[PDB]
């Protein structure tokens, strides 16, 4: 009924950063998301789980290789696991 | 073993622009991708729905909307519908 899912999500770069907040490693959270921002706007969630960046999985890797994967383009591609309701009718 | 996926890409502008042709909306298809182009190779397949361009949802924008919206950017974010295949082996 209430479990967890993996969906992915794009962030375009603005001039204020992605706009989110990022912590841990092995794995990493997103510990905050900025009002406005560009995460925000792509779908980003407080306390989702980022799988994959760019394709690379990271499940594994530590916080910093994590930031530098993020950081190396204009835009970047997730793979995020986050709370999801399965509901019956 | 087929289905359907949810999925994003990002494409960047050939020298022939984005290499797809969209039609109708609500939601908005890919009615087919030229050969070699560049929506090809960034996995764009004919019959995929556009649901989201640039962090925007436009399964509820009008055929005018969702081109400006593509054709705003040198490359473009899709968060697109499609069918898939798929085998364990």
């Given at each position: 009924m209430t479990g967890l899912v993996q969906r992915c999500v794009i962030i375009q770069k603005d001039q204020h950063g992605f706009g989110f907040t990022v912590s841990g490693d092995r794995?990493?959270?997103?510990?905050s998301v900025r009002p406005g921002g560009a995460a925000m706007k792509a779908g980003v969630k407080e306390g989702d789980r980022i799988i994959k960046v760019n394709g690379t999985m990271?499940?594994?890797?530590?916080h910093l290789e994590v930031v530098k994967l993020i950081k190396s383009g204009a835009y970047v591609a997730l793979t995020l696991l986050g709370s999801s309701t399965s509901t019956t009718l």
């Open positions: 794995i990493v959270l997103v510990q990271v499940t594994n890797s530590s």
